[PDB]
Design an enzyme around this catalytic site. Structure first.
Site, mmCIF file in Angstrom:
data_model
loop_
_atom_site.group_PDB
_atom_site.id
_atom_site.type_symbol
_atom_site.label_atom_id
_atom_site.label_comp_id
_atom_site.label_asym_id
_atom_site.label_seq_id
_atom_site.Cartn_x
_atom_site.Cartn_y
_atom_site.Cartn_z
ATOM 1 N NE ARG A 174 9.962 -15.209 32.872
ATOM 2 C CZ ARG A 174 10.785 -14.907 33.875
ATOM 3 N NH1 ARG A 174 11.936 -15.557 34.015
ATOM 4 N NH2 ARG A 174 10.459 -13.953 34.740
ATOM 5 C CG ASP A 239 10.422 -10.575 30.220
ATOM 6 O OD1 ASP A 239 9.768 -11.436 29.605
ATOM 7 O OD2 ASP A 239 10.451 -10.524 31.475
ATOM 8 C CB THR A 240 13.589 -5.059 27.223
ATOM 9 O OG1 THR A 240 12.839 -4.279 28.152
ATOM 10 C CG2 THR A 240 12.717 -5.413 26.013
ATOM 11 C CB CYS A 345 12.451 1.907 22.963
ATOM 12 S SG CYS A 345 12.174 1.487 24.697
ATOM 13 C CG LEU A 346 7.401 5.888 23.734
ATOM 14 C CD1 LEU A 346 5.932 5.509 23.903
ATOM 15 C CD2 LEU A 346 7.613 7.375 23.486
ATOM 16 N N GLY A 347 10.842 3.938 26.310
ATOM 17 C CA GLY A 347 11.643 3.718 27.505
ATOM 18 C C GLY A 347 13.151 3.784 27.323
HETATM 19 C C1 HEM Z 1 17.140 -2.643 27.150
HETATM 20 C C2 HEM Z 1 15.889 -2.205 27.346
HETATM 21 C C3 HEM Z 1 14.853 -2.033 26.208
HETATM 22 C C4 HEM Z 1 14.896 -2.420 24.928
HETATM 23 C C5 HEM Z 1 16.017 -3.173 24.187
HETATM 24 C C6 HEM Z 1 13.664 -2.016 24.293
HETATM 25 C C7 HEM Z 1 13.325 -2.239 22.983
HETATM 26 C C8 HEM Z 1 12.199 -1.720 22.375
HETATM 27 C C9 HEM Z 1 11.933 -1.793 20.957
HETATM 28 C C10 HEM Z 1 12.859 -2.468 19.930
HETATM 29 C C11 HEM Z 1 10.765 -1.203 20.716
HETATM 30 C C12 HEM Z 1 10.091 -1.039 19.330
HETATM 31 C C13 HEM Z 1 9.274 -2.294 19.017
HETATM 32 C C14 HEM Z 1 8.673 -2.257 17.632
HETATM 33 O O1 HEM Z 1 8.930 -1.324 16.836
HETATM 34 O O2 HEM Z 1 7.913 -3.204 17.317
HETATM 35 C C15 HEM Z 1 10.250 -0.732 21.985
HETATM 36 C C16 HEM Z 1 9.067 -0.073 22.183
HETATM 37 C C17 HEM Z 1 8.578 0.325 23.398
HETATM 38 N N1 HEM Z 1 9.213 0.274 24.641
HETATM 39 FE FE1 HEM Z 1 11.077 -0.523 24.924
HETATM 40 N N2 HEM Z 1 12.887 -1.401 25.237
HETATM 41 C C18 HEM Z 1 13.592 -1.356 26.423
HETATM 42 C C19 HEM Z 1 13.194 -0.807 27.619
HETATM 43 C C20 HEM Z 1 11.978 -0.198 27.841
HETATM 44 C C21 HEM Z 1 11.556 0.450 29.067
HETATM 45 C C22 HEM Z 1 12.427 0.569 30.336
HETATM 46 C C23 HEM Z 1 10.297 0.888 28.891
HETATM 47 C C24 HEM Z 1 9.344 1.627 29.866
HETATM 48 C C25 HEM Z 1 9.690 2.029 31.084
HETATM 49 C C26 HEM Z 1 9.903 0.558 27.547
HETATM 50 C C27 HEM Z 1 8.683 0.851 26.987
HETATM 51 C C28 HEM Z 1 8.384 0.759 25.649
HETATM 52 C C29 HEM Z 1 7.136 1.179 25.060
HETATM 53 C C30 HEM Z 1 5.940 1.797 25.820
HETATM 54 C C31 HEM Z 1 7.264 0.893 23.563
HETATM 55 C C32 HEM Z 1 6.241 1.113 22.421
HETATM 56 C C33 HEM Z 1 6.512 2.425 21.693
HETATM 57 C C34 HEM Z 1 5.491 2.600 20.593
HETATM 58 O O3 HEM Z 1 4.910 1.595 20.111
HETATM 59 O O4 HEM Z 1 5.273 3.768 20.191
HETATM 60 N N3 HEM Z 1 10.949 -0.083 26.918
HETATM 61 N N4 HEM Z 1 11.147 -1.059 22.989
#
Ligand code: HEM
EC number: 1.14.15.1
Length: 402
Positions: A174, A239-240, A345-347
């Site tokens: 943003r 932001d998620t 998602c790793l998170g």
């Molecule tokens: C409601 C909360 C969240 C949602 C809806 C969400 C959603 C996602 C999604 C859909 C992806 C896959 C994206 C793709 O395939 O292009 C992703 C990847 C990832 N997320 Fe989240 N996320 C959330 C929270 C978090 C949190 C809390 C963390 C870290 C503390 C995090 C870290 C990551 C990372 C590092 C990846 C990349 C994994 C990879 O490429 O191997 N996410 N997330």
């Protein structure tokens, strides 16, 4: 500004959906995207908006494309095609597996289990600070401060660094104009690099220490790889979580019956969290074609971008009956809210704990709350769809103090 239709794309598949400004937005962002699932819309469509790209509109195709990394590459994961270098976002298997394993050591379930009480203490402090006021903008006053503080905990960073770090991450999604994306990213690296170096020499058990001392390809992780992973661990959870918590709280403020269910049966909160993740799914990422490929009767061309909206799988009536209805007792909650396939998602474990802890503590301390009188909640659409602001009100006399 429609991009001219590429000659391989048949006109009958054209549906000019704008992921950044969908036409039905005032009705709610999920509803706005769900127009792609009306019966006159094919499973796979082409939009001329935003450079021109495919959209898969159904859970079956969305899942299949995320599984088929050989055809659908993460090398260009964002629409439109146009400095982003976080790891492992843009990596395909097998390059990606080693980096995921390392990231998993720092945000995996065992870490989340250890952090849970700290997360609760943080949620409690934020809620208690707001409780006697009888009002807040939930998005700004709770949602925004919460995930950044959890990152500082995970990464062992001092709270004094929050305003500047939050400013940089805000600039990447943003921008106010003070910084380009590249400048914000480099400032983030200016911050992380010295810390990474120090923690390679003098490690703790925090996320930066573990990443910095990790192994890639039988050799030490490089500083460049470490900063790029830490950057993603920071931005991926902001932001998620902010926007998802906001969608959930908007719904709870608006549906006293669902609210009461969770007040009366707090044990249902983890199931409710899953149903909310389905109903208020919010990510829409994409892939790029590695080669010409016929996919479900449709000719895709090498280099075509395809939007594969994580949001849509769980809203698909073919996956969940009466998909716009929220029912915390659904026996099968089908969704891809955290993605699907090698980039899942790793998170996800940290996020669920954040959501559940937030709902548990909020419903304990402020059980009765409403949308502020007169307020109309506005949504926004994009790669991470969201809530512009969420003014809430309550009577402090109905709250429970710490
Ligand atoms: C409601 C909360 C969240 C949602 C809806 C969400 C959603 C996602 C999604 C859909 C992806 C896959 C994206 C793709 O395939 O292009 C992703 C990847 C990832 N997320 Fe989240 N996320 C959330 C929270 C978090 C949190 C809390 C963390 C870290 C503390 C995090 C870290 C990551 C990372 C590092 C990846 C990349 C994994 C990879 O490429 O191997 N996410 N997330």
């Amino acid at each position: 500004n429609l991009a001219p239709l590429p000659p391989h794309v048949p006109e009958h598949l054209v549906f000019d959906f704008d992921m950044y400004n969908p036409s039905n937005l005032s009705a709610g962002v999920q509803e706005a995207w769900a127009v792609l699932q009306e019966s006159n819309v094919p499973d796979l469509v082409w939009t001329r908006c935003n450079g021109g790209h495919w959209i898969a509109t159904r859970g079956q195709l969305i899942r299949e494309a995320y599984e088929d990394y050989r055809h659908f590459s993460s090398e260009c994961p964002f629409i439109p095609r146009e400095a982003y270098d976080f790891i492992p976002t843009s990596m395909d298997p097998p390059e990606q597996r080693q980096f995921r394993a390392l990231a998993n050591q720092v945000v995996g379930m065992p870490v989340v289990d250890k952090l849970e009480n700290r997360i609760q203490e943080l949620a409690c402090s934020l809620i208690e600070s707001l409780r006697p006021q009888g009002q807040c903008n939930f998005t700004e006053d709770y949602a925004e401060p919460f995930p950044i503080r959890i990152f500082m905990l995970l990464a062992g960073l001092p709270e004094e660094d929050i305003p500047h770090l939050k400013y940089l991450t805000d600039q990447m999604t943003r921008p106010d104009g003070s910084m380009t994306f590249a400048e914000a990213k480099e400032a983030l690296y200016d911050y992380l690099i010295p810390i990474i170096e120090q923690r390679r020499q003098k490690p703790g058990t925090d996320a930066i220490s573990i990443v910095a001392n990790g192994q890639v390809n039988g050799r030490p992780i490089t500083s460049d790889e470490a900063k790029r992973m830490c950057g993603l661990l920071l931005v991926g959870g902001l932001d998620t979580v902010v926007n998802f918590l906001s969608f959930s709280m908007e719904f709870l403020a608006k549906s006293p019956e669902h609210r009461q269910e969770l007040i009366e049966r707090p044990e249902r909160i983890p199931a409710a969290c899953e149903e909310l993740l389905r109903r208020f799914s919010l990510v829409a990422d994409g892939r790029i074609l590695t080669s010409d490929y016929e996919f479900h009767g449709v000719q895709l061309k090498k280099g075509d971008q395809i939007l594969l909206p994580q949001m849509l799988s769980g809203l698909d009536e073919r996956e969940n009956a009466a998909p716009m209805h929220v029912d915390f007792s659904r026996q099968k909650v089908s969704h891809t809210t955290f993605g699907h396939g090698s980039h899942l998602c790793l998170g996800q474990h940290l996020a669920r704990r954040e959501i559940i802890v937030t709902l548990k503590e909020w419903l304990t301390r402020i059980p009765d709350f409403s949308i502020a009188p007169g307020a109309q909640i506005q949504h926004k659409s994009g790669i991470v769809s969201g809530v512009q602001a969420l003014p809430l009100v309550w009577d402090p006399a109905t709250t429970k103090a710490v």
